[PDB]
Amino acid sequence: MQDIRQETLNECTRAEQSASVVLWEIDLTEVGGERYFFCNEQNEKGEPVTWQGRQYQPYPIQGSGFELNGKGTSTRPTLTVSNLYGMVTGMAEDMQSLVGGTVVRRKVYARFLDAVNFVNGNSYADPEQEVISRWRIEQCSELSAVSASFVLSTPTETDGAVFPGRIMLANTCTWTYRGDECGYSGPAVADEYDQPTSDITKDKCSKCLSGCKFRNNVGNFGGFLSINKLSQ
Amino acid sequence: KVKVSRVPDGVAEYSVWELKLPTLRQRLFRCVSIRENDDGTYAITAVQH
Amino acid sequence: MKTFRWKVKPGMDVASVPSVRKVRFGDGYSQRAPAGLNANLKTYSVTLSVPREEATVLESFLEEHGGWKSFLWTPPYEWRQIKVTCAKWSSRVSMLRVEFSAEFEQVVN
Amino acid sequence: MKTFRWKVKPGMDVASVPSVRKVRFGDGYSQRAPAGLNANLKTYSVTLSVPREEATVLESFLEEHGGWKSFLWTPPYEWRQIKVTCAKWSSRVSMLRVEFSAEFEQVVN
Amino acid sequence: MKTFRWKVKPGMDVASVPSVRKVRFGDGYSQRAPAGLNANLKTYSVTLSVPREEATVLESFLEEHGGWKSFLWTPPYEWRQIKVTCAKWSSRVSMLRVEFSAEFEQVVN
Amino acid sequence: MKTFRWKVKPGMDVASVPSVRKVRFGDGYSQRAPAGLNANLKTYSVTLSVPREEATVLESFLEEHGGWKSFLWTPPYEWRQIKVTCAKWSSRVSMLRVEFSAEFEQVVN
Amino acid sequence: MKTFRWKVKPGMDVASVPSVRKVRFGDGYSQRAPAGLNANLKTYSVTLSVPREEATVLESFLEEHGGWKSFLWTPPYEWRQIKVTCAKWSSRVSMLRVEFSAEFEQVVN
Amino acid sequence: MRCMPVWNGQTLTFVQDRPSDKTWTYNRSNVVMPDDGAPFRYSFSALKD
Amino acid sequence: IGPAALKAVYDMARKGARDEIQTQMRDGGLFS
Amino acid sequence: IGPAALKAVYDMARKGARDEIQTQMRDGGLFS
Amino acid sequence: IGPAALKAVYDMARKGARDEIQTQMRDGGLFS
Amino acid sequence: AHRAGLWLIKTELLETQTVDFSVGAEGLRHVPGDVIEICDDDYAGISTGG
Numbered sequence A: 001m002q003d004i005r006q007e008t009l010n011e012c013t014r015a016e017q018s019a020s021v022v023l024w025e026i027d028l029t030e031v032g033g034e035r036y037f038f039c040n041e042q043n044e045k046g047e048p049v050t051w052q053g054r055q056y057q058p059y060p061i062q063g064s065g066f067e068l069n070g071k072g073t074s075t076r077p078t079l080t081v082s083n084l085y086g087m088v089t090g091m092a093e094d095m096q097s098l099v100g101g102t103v104v105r106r107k108v109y110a111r112f113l114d115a116v117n118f119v120n121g122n123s124y125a126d127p128e129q130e131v132i133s134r135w136r137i138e139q140c141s142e143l144s145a146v147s148a149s150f151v152l153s154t155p156t157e158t159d160g161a162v163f164p165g166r167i168m169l170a171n172t173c174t175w176t177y178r179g180d181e182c183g184y185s186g187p188a189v190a191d192e193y194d195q196p197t198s199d200i201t202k203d204k205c206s207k208c209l210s211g212c213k214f215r216n217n218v219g220n221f222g223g224f225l226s227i228n229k230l231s232q
Numbered sequence B: 001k002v003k004v005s006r007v008p009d010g011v012a013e014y015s016v017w018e019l020k021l022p023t024l025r026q027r028l029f030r031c032v033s034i035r036e037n038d039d040g041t042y043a044i045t046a047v048q049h
Numbered sequence C, D, E, F, G: 001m002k003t004f005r006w007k008v009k010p011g012m013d014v015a016s017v018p019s020v021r022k023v024r025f026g027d028g029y030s031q032r033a034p035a036g037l038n039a040n041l042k043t044y045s046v047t048l049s050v051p052r053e054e055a056t057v058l059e060s061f062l063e064e065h066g067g068w069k070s071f072l073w074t075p076p077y078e079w080r081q082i083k084v085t086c087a088k089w090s091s092r093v094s095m096l097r098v099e100f101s102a103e104f105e106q107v108v109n
Numbered sequence H: 001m002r003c004m005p006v007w008n009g010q011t012l013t014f015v016q017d018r019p020s021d022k023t024w025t026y027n028r029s030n031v032v033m034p035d036d037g038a039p040f041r042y043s044f045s046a047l048k049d
Numbered sequence I, J, K: 001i002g003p004a005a006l007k008a009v010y011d012m013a014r015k016g017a018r019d020e021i022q023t024q025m026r027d028g029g030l031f032s
Numbered sequence L: 001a002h003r004a005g006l007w008l009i010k011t012e013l014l015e016t017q018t019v020d021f022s023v024g025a026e027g028l029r030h031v032p033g034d035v036i037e038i039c040d041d042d043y044a045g046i047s048t049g050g
């Protein structure tokens, strides 16, 4: 069971109910963009729908195919949003196809919606009632002048992952440079072609033994030297 | 008509009631999938428990 | 936005169908709820006849808006100004008069 | 629950389709049994004629409920009060009168 | 089982279609055989008119049977008592009389 | 390019269906915009009546162009010369007259 | 090849639809070209009435050809001999005369 | 450990097979009636399964 | 509506078959 | 009857594809 | 046009599925 | 190992039934793993719910 609030359950039980609103939020902070809020309808006063303080904007967007099943493959829902005016194109050329960002979906009954929306106000307004679920954009299946279609996926997907993941190599270091495991923090020394330099912008390790010797960090070398003698 | 021992507070009209006989055995189940549908309904699949 | 000036011949058909979400349970019980926040929008169906010389003006007016721009019009049914858009229209050219038949959808935009 | 106080015109049509479970393969032995308790719910096809001024009140009454809310109405056919819902209605505006067509569906809730 | 007492207006339509198994060979030769052991069953389509006061009795009679119970009736076509079931029916409520239209299928059960 | 010189009969039907791009899911926010430059191209449903002897000339004129070639024609609707193509036409032969029915579609090329 | 002798009553319908290869580009531009080398072929629809005694002759003539052989005939529309074939036909037998209905497709073979 | 990894709405959860108590009861009035007329459809396992 | 409906349904069936095979090949499916 | 028929046919095609794959998996089929 | 259309579409879907599997079986396909 | 085998044997001997149904507008509460009770009047033959 999801820990749904009691008033939402009471609303679900009743025979005659209020409108069900889905409030889409597309988050591009991890990729490097801004977070965008969309909703399918305007409110009763012809203004953007106001939930808490967010004020989601009106825009034709639909998401279908959501499911909760662990027996077979992953779920892979689908989200369709229109770009007649070229917004999705502007986001995709810039933020590299909107691949990797988060999509958050909220389902709130219109009974609990904020009092700003209705012309006569709402006496039952309660901002705590919503049902939230998070997904991650996976691909842009289509992009046209009429619409654009994305396919979402679960944040925890196991398509390209292999467990042990760490390879024993004879001549190449697998660590990340200046990371936790390499443990190097000092002046810029060399380039990625083992050419001396001092600018901090173009300092990169070549993952070679000479590249590591430039740092005098041979102790933390990722690879295991002289294996190829035994493997032979 | 029945005559219950006590009437819980605020039992509105058109609310679900179940009769639990001692003879009959419960038929439990365990959900395995809940497919959200466009009409606003949910399809639920279960396996015996 | 420009306004529709010409008058409508009697026989206008106002068809309104709301959108609802229905679930039908076992013994006739059910759940009903509105689908959207906004109220429903009507679809006025009109017929109007104009002289041959004035047909060009009306045809050009409907042509310039295409099927994507909306214009103000005060239907005789309720006498309140609304925003309507005409996606398609037709005309039958007689000897003296031209008769237009078109369906004005209502849009909140 | 509001009530419907307007008067219908001759020709009201009552269509009843009982819900029944029947199994029959080809021309074989057939078995039939009811689907539930409230199997038979009738849908009433009504027609209303009201003047130009009174059309707004009826239209507002039908629009305010939408397709979801149910009102009380006592049909002229059997004279027993029932709860109905109007999911679609069409108006045909004339010079002096307006003619309404609608379908009322009996509901248990 | 109860008996259908009310009378039928002229214009009854009796439609009987047997079920057969046909195989069409090359040059117009063929195989024909009856599908089942039992004889075919007709589908009488009747219409009848009753006053306003007596409409409720007939509607209640057809209602209590649902679409699953069969009642005896002697069609004027052949004057032999049979077993019929009315799956659906409709009525047009005039000012003085109500006109029913229904299809009585014949069942051997 | 050859021209059409015959005269049409009362009752020409000019059908206009502009090409537009609209996106709307359910009852939500709707967006519309034109599809191209020459969005609106009309199809004229004409009717021609010619004697028995002059049916051959009109039939030959419509046949030699086929459905592909386009000819100039000045519609009586707006009196501006356009390029049209006739893709289908049907003739109803009478004792002294022949009646033609065809659809001319405006084209850009 | 045998020739058709019997005469056709007024009301003959001549329907001709050419075959074209069309491609529609973005802004109303297009490509049009004929599909085949040969010119299109009309499909005359005729109606003729003959006495009861002469009906057998016409029926035998049309039955002899089946639906695969063609006979020469000179339509009143253009007065040039062509090759036609009748795939299907029907006749309505009155007290004194029999009226036939058939569609003579034109075939170049 | 006989648990099925299912992605809940917000977090990846593991559902194990241990005895548990009921949550909600669904009678013939709570569930949707299809046009077929059967609210519940039961299926069983195969012989060789 | 004639054999054209059958041809269209056959094409749609083939497209669905390719889509289903590709869906099954990924992790957790029958083919994996 | 519009795109709805196409969508329904697509769903039925996918169901048929799953059923056919499961049928072919067992003994004697292509995948066995 | 009633359930008969559904049954016919299902049969055509199964035929398409078999054809697609056999097509993908040969060289270059997914199953190769 | 013996308990691992016994679990398969017992779960495939004891639990051999599945059910599928649709519940409208109140399925927000359910996630996989919930245990529910089914009171089918037709199955039992006696009226148990309303």
Ligand code: SF4
Residues within 6 Å of the ligand: A173, A174, A175, A176, A177, A178, A182, A183, A184, A205, A206, A207, A208, A209, A211, A212, A213, A215, A217, A218, A220, A221, A222
């Ligand atoms: S080669 Fe040495 S300095 Fe470079 S990443 Fe590996 S451990 Fe760090």
